[PDB]
Each structure stands twice: as C-alpha cells, then as structure tokens.
C-alpha cells in the first residue's frame, strides 16, 4: 500500500482565495506527473490540474486554467494549489492523485489517490454592515457601533464631516465568526444632548452600502 | 477536444445481475480509456488500465471493450459491494477528461415519499435560531424537488438538502430539508410547508404548521 | 518597489491545518533565499521558516519544527508554508521575506517584505454539540436533532440499542457558521406513544461529550 | 544564541538623543541588525554589521558594539522615532531576535477616567449581550481590566483594544467589551469593571445592576 494526505480545506468566500497541499506517504513523488482532481456537489470527477516530473510542464483544466497555479517539492514530497479568487461552482472535494503504473510510461492512469479534503466556497463575496447607536446616558460620550461587515475597510464620519473635535474611530476587531465589527465614539459637552443632532455617517464601499445613523438619548 | 458520452447517467440492477456500460468518445482516441469505480465521498479506485485490459488485484467479475470511438464496460454478476458509480476516463499525456458517471444501484418498483414536516424545538427557539426540517421518509428512485414555501412565499436560498443513500432492507432513497430563519424572522410570519414532487407523486405533496399552533 | 503578496490566511483551529503562500513581482524568487516570519502577541517578531536558493537548505524555528514545512516554486515564483498541527501560540500576522541586498551576498538581512496575512488558531480544537427532540405531531415519525459541532462524527442511537427498524441518521451538512449540523429520526406505531418512551443516547467521539435526550409528544 | 533588550518601554521627549541597548547571552561578534516596527506594519531595517547604516536610513539612527554589549542611539528623536525597536542577531542562515524595547513620548501619570456601558436594548434582543469598559486618556499604557459578573471573576470572555499615543495630549485609552448570550446574561445582575493602573492608588470599579 501507497498514501497521499490532502490538507488546507474548509470553508471560503467568493472571491477569497485559499490554497491546498498533498503530502505522501511510503513513497517518493519526484518520480511522478502529479494530479488534482474533483468532485463537485453533482457527483461527478472533474480533473483540475497536473505538473510533470521534473516541474517541466503544468496544466489545467479550463475552467480553473489561469486563476489556479499547481506547484511542487520533489524533495519533502510535497505537491501545491493556490485558488485565487474562487468561484462558488469550486466547491468540491479536491483530490490529489499521482500518475502512475509498476512500470511508469509517457501515458498511465491515475492509481493511486488520497482521501480527499472539502472546499465550501460561500457565495457571499462582501457583506454589508449593521450600524447601531451607542447611546449617551460635564462631557458626555456617544458613538456608532459599526458590525458584521465584510472586507475591510468601513469608514466613518459625524455630521457628515462638519463633527471632528474629539472623534476616536477604532481598529476594527476580527470576531470569531470571521466577520470585522468597528466602535466610532465622540465627547461632547453634555449641555448639548437636547438640541444638537449627531449622525455617523458609515461607508462600506466594498458592499456599497451607505448608513447614516441619529445618536440621542434614550 | 474529446467529451466522453458515457451511457447510461443511473443503472438499476440487484444482486447477481451482469450489467453492461457503454463510453462513446466525442472524437475518435487510440483506445486510451480507463474505467474507475467511486462509493460515495471516496476516493476512485482504477478497475481497467486500457480499454479490456483489467487491472492487477481487481475482481475477475470485471471486463470491458474498445473501438476507437465506442467502448464499454461490464460486470459479471453484481455483488452488494458493486453499488456503487462507474467512471471511465479518455487519458492524454498531460490531461484527461471523465464521463458523467453511470451511477450503479439496486432496483424496485417507484415509490412515492412519505412527506412529514417539523416546526423549531421552543429550545432551539430562545437560543435564537429556527432551523424547519422537511422529510421524505422512503421513495424510490433518487430524483426528487422540495420547495420551502414561507405565507405562501415560494423561498430561495436558504435551505440545505442531504440524501441518505440506499437502505439496507428496502433499497428506498430518504431525503431530508433544513430551512434555517433567525429566531426574529421565523416570529414574523405563520404557516411554514414544504412541497414534494416525485416519480411516485400524481401531484405535489405539501406539508404544513401553523407557528404556535 | 519591489512587489509580495501574501495568500491564504484567515481562521483555523487547534489542532488544524493550512498552508500559506505568498506570490511575487518585480523580481524573479530563483536567486534569493526566501523566509515566512510572523509577529505574535505580544508585538514581537518570530522566524518561522527559510528555504534557500535551489530548495538546498530547509530551516525551522524549534517551536514549529517537524508541524509545518516551507516550499518554493521558481519557474512561476511562488512560495509555500504548510501548518499541520496549529497550536494558539501560531496566532499572529505572517509574512513571506525576500533574505537581500542591493549587492546580494552569503549572509544577508531581510529586504524586501509582502504587506502580510493574518492567522488565528482559535482554541475550539473539539466543539461539543448541541441536541434538541424532534417531537412526534398509523405511523408517527420522531427523531433528534444535533446543530454546532466540529469535528465530526457525531454519533447516535435509539434507547441504547432496543430500537433498530425505521431509524435513520442523516449525513451532516456544513452551516455558514463553519460547523456541521444533523438529524436522526425514527418512525414507529402512533399507538405506541402514550406507551413507549423514545431517548436518543447520543455521542460526539472527538470530544468524548455524551448526551442524551428523552423525545416524547409535546 | 539568546538575546536580552532594554529598557523594555522608553518614554523620551523630541529632540532627544536616547540609546537602546541590546545584550547577548554569548559572544555574537557584530553579527547584529536593528529594525524600526510601526503598528500593524512589517519591521524596516535601520543598520546591519553592529553599526552599518542601510541605504537611506536618516544618519540620527547610529549603532554600535561587539561582543556581548551593543547599543542602538537615535540623536534627536523626531515624531516618526516613536516606534516599536528590535536587535536581530544574524548568522549564514538562520536568526534570532531579542523581546524588543518600545518607544513613546514622555508626559506625567494620567489615571483612566473609566466609564461602563450595558448592552443596548436592540442588539439584548438578537440575543447577544456586548457591555464595553472603557478606560479613557491615561499614560503610561500599562492598565489592566478586569470584569466581575455577582462578584465572579470574568475569564476567556473579553477582548481588548488601545489607542496609540493622541496626538495632541499623548494618552491612550482602551475599550474592552465582555461578550454573553443572552441566555448567559440575564443569570447575574451587577456587572462591574475593575481598573488598576499607576495613575490609581487603589483599583477603580464601575458597574451596573442589570436592569
């Protein structure tokens, strides 16, 4: 028996891009053309991409051919797939598999294959922020918190710019949820909570979502 | 550039069964197919390494033939290990190309599902999340469309399906649909149903509940 | 400039793998010895990998030594990082960085440097589930429901074994949250409800978590 | 090899000639580096060989020893010195670094003005409770929070953030929200928040009772 250990799949966003690996077991691949291929969620195996012996010549399947690069290590017998920018029809399993026969020749079939690993691209490529108040109970504090937005970056602005003494627009946090949430604050003299009207105004070009928020007591 | 016409896309058959597959090249090849099996989420296994030529440590139930253009495979008396898809493969020197494989499976009349539709646990509920299960029992064969339909609005894109394969007693298909809602949403509307068509069915099939009811 | 682009970051657990990769312009990769560092925690830099000219020499700090493994790819000017095994300690920015000099030389400083990509290795390496009855309106269907679990499988049965005929377990499927859920259901006599008590003794094996469910009329 | 640095924080005005100084555990001859790092950006060379200054470096930056002993003075510190600082030993091919020294412009103690949010109503509704602390204008950087839900000691449930230096009174502040279901948060009522910081002779505490 022979082995190959596909790793670095899970869960994607379109257009996001993830690479994986193939390692091998009981055997060394600089001997071997090396082979990905897939099964999408219709069942059948699409073939994906192939390098060579020797790291001569690399292909692709055409709808991957351009967007995707193969790779190899003939010396820690490792093979590679960078997937720039995936398509939602890119989800699959991904196999790795080695050209191959006892006797090797310019053309054999595929015998011996890994157990394959999931690839999920998620079809929601940006997504557009909440926007909620946080509301001002001397000087008192108001502010805008900006949530569940998706890339980088959002920014904001109060009153539409004319607001910028004292405004603190954070670093974003990474939730664990994999989205960015953002806290955008400002002091004002509390003797204006009454009659001055404050708006944070919150772009996120990258969804083009634009949200203008009031900010008052509650 | 060669497409392969592999034929049939489903064979039905049972225990004993020899059964005949046939690959037809979109262009002619000098006889450079081979044949796979793939279980369902493995990985292929090879069976034959050149059209008629079967591979070393493979069943002797195996054969198969080529023409240049035409070709198949066959198996001489299916055993329950055999109930699996069919792949063939046209191989060049640095591509390949597959058939949409002949999905091999074991026969009975057509059976209509038995629909049954679930509301959210109130446990799941207050956590803040409803996830509405739709289930079609037992049916034969595989082919069949389930559609969430929330106050009469036909939904779209947010459920997910999962197929259990066949059953060890009564060879049937089973189908089950999650359609997921925040608990927010799913408060705003009432009636939640699920609509069935099948090869059984001489019309659709829908589930409903009343949210609370 | 000279031109790096880091690929492949983002969330992953402990226990996990990934790989990163980083891609060039501006300059060919072949003639210099090529790095991946990352900035921990604490705001300090760590050296994670080097790879030298022609893949002659591997390196590894010891405290990813023998879990990840660096590889390169001239001839398309791509280099790699596997991370087999991350632990929380493998939280940080990475970067891919070109070892350089205006007048290159045997032993030289880093140079030039990709803009990086952030890795988190959350601690959820075995997430327990969560199980909910799905509870009975002839034949009556009832049934369990798991959500919130990684890795697989969680596992499932009927009062300890007493009950077989019309039991079926559902293949899982994989949220948008990145966890799997699934259902197990029975069907059984309508007249046996008031009668029988129907549990669900169920297991999620990476976690060792067991539970159980009593699933009864509403 | 193994490397020391210090001093780990150093608070100086601009325009002053300030020295870092970087010791290794063995003799390194001057096979050592040193590097600028900003905030959320990859570390820049400033000198290499103990004292050899990289191409373009502003010649106020300086290095010098060998041995054991080396030092990394900036004469004249302008408003784009106030950075992270790193000596890096170097060797044919490998490299080790030293824990670093951070530099910030000097200003007296300032304690934190600390001030408790509950979570808002609209997002209590979703089911996700988020209360923030925040710790406002105080100097040096070092402050620590910790939260109290009934008197219970908060751990593994918060996250935190801190400014960099404001630019017209060279404070910091700091935010660190404490993160609950809604099934979690309506369990316990007080919800406190205790700073210490050097500016504070004892702890501070602010709090809320839920609801």
């Known amino acids: 028996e022979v082995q190959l250990v596909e790793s670095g799949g899970g869960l994607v966003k379109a257009g996001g891009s993830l690479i994986l690996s193939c390692?091998?077991?009981?055997?060394?691949?600089?001997?071997?053309?090396?082979?990905?291929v897939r099964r999408v969620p219709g069942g059948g195996l699409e073939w994906?991409?192939?390098?060579?012996?020797?790291?001569?010549?690399?292909?692709?399947?055409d709808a991957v051919k351009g967007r995707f690069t193969v790779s190899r290590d003939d010396l820690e017998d490792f093979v590679y797939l960078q997937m720039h920018k995936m398509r939602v029809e890119d989800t699959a399993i991904?196999?790795?598999?080695?050209?191959?026969?006892?006797?090797?020749?310019?053309?054999?079939?595929?015998?011996?294959?890994?157990?394959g690993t999931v690839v999920t691209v998620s079809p929601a490529s940006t997504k557009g922020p909440s926007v909620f108040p946080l509301a001002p109970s001397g000087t008192a504090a108001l502010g805008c918190l900006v949530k569940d937005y998706f890339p980088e970056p959002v920014t904001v602005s109060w009153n539409s710019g004319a607001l910028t003494s004292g405004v603190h627009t954070f670093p974003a946090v990474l939730q664990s949820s994999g989205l960015y949430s953002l806290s955008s604050v400002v002091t004002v003299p509390s003797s204006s909570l009454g009659t001055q009207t404050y708006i944070c105004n919150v772009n996120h070009k990258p969804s083009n979502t634009k949200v203008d928020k009031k900010v008052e007591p509650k | 550039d060669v497409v392969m016409t592999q034929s049939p896309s489903t064979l039905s058959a049972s225990v004993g069964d020899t059964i005949t597959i046939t690959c037809?090249?979109?262009?002619?090849?000098?006889?450079?197919?081979?044949?796979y099996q793939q279980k369902p989420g493995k990985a292929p296994k090879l069976?034959?390494?050149?059209?008629?030529?079967?591979?070393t440590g493979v069943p002797s139930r195996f054969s198969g033939s080529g023409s240049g253009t035409e070709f198949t495979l066959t198996i001489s008396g299916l055993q329950f290990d055999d109930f699996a898809t069919?792949?063939?493969?046209?191989?060049?020197?640095?591509?390949?190309?597959?058939?949409?494989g002949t999905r091999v499976e074991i026969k009975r009349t057509v059976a209509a599902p038995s629909v049954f539709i679930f509301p959210p646990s109130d446990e799941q509920l207050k956590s803040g999340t409803a996830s509405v299960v739709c289930l079609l029992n037992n049916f034969y064969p595989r082919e069949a469309k389930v559609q969430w339909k929330v106050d009469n609005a036909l939904q779209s894109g947010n459920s997910q399906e999962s197929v259990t394969e066949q059953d060890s007693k009564d060879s049937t298909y089973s189908l089950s649909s999650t359609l997921t809602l925040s608990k927010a949403d799913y408060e705003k509307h009432k009636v939640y149903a699920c609509e069935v068509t099948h090869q059984g069915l001489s019309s659709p099939v829908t589930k409903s509940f009343n949210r609370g009811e | 400039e000279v031109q790096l682009v880091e690929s492949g970051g983002g969330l992953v657990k402990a226990g996990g793998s990934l790989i990163l990769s980083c891609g060039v312009s501006?300059?060919?990769?072949?003639?210099?010895?090529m790095n991946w560092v990352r900035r921990v925690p604490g705001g300090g830099l760590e050296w994670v990998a080097s790879?030298?000219?022609?893949?002659?020499?591997?390196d590894y700090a010891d405290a990813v030594k023998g879990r990840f493994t660096v590889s390169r790819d001239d001839l398309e000017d791509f280099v790699y990082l596997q991370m087999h095994k991350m632990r929380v300690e493998d939280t940080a920015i990475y970067y891919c960085?070109?070892?350089?000099?205006?007048?290159?030389?045997?032993?030289?400083?880093?140079?030039?440097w990709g803009p990086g990509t952030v890795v988190t290795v959350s601690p959820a390496s075995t997430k327990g589930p969560s199980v909910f009855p799905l509870a009975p309106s002839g034949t009556a269907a009832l049934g369990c429901l798991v959500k919130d679990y990684f890795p697989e499988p969680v596992t499932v049965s009927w009062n300890s074994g007493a009950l077989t005929s019309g039991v079926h377990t559902f293949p899982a499927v994989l949220q948008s949250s990145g966890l799997y859920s699934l259902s197990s259901v029975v069907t059984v006599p309508s007249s046996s409800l008031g009668t029988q008590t129907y549990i669900c003794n169920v297991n999620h094996k990476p976690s060792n978590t067991k539970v159980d469910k009593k699933v009864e009329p509403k | 090899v193994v490397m020391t640095q210090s001093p780990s924080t150093l608070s100086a005005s601009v325009g002053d000639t300030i020295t870092i100084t970087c010791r290794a555990s063995?003799?390194?001859?001057?096979?050592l580096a040193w590097y600028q790092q900003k905030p959320g950006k990859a570390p820049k060379l400033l000198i290499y060989?103990?004292?050899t200054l990289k191409t373009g470096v502003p010649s106020r930056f300086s290095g010098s020893g060998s041995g054991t002993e080396f030092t990394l003075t900036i004469s004249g510190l302008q408003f784009d010195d106030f950075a992270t600082y790193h000596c890096?030993?170097?060797?044919?091919?490998?490299?080790?670094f030293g824990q670093g020294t951070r530099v910030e412009i000097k200003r007296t103690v300032a304690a934190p003005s600390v001030f408790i949010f509950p979570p808002s109503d609209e997002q209590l509704k979703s089911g996700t409770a988020s209360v923030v602390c925040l710790l406002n204008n105080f100097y040096p950087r070092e402050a620590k929070v910790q939260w109290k839900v009934d008197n219970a000691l908060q751990s593994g449930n918060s996250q935190e953030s801190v400014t960099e230096q404001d630019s017209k009174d060279s404070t910091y502040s700091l935010s660190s929200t404490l993160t609950l279901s809604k099934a979690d948060y309506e369990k316990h009522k007080v919800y406190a928040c205790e700073v210490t910081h050097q500016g504070l002779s004892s702890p501070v505490t602010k709090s809320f009772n839920r609801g």
């Open positions: 960085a070109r070892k350089g000099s205006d007048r290159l030389s045997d032993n030289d400083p880093f140079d030039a």
């Open positions: 501006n300059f060919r990769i072949s003639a210099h010895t």
């Open positions: 790879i030298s000219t022609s893949s002659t020499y591997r």
């Open positions: 063995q003799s390194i001859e001057t096979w």
């Open positions: 060989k103990a004292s």
């Open positions: 890096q030993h170097y060797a044919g091919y490998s490299a080790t």
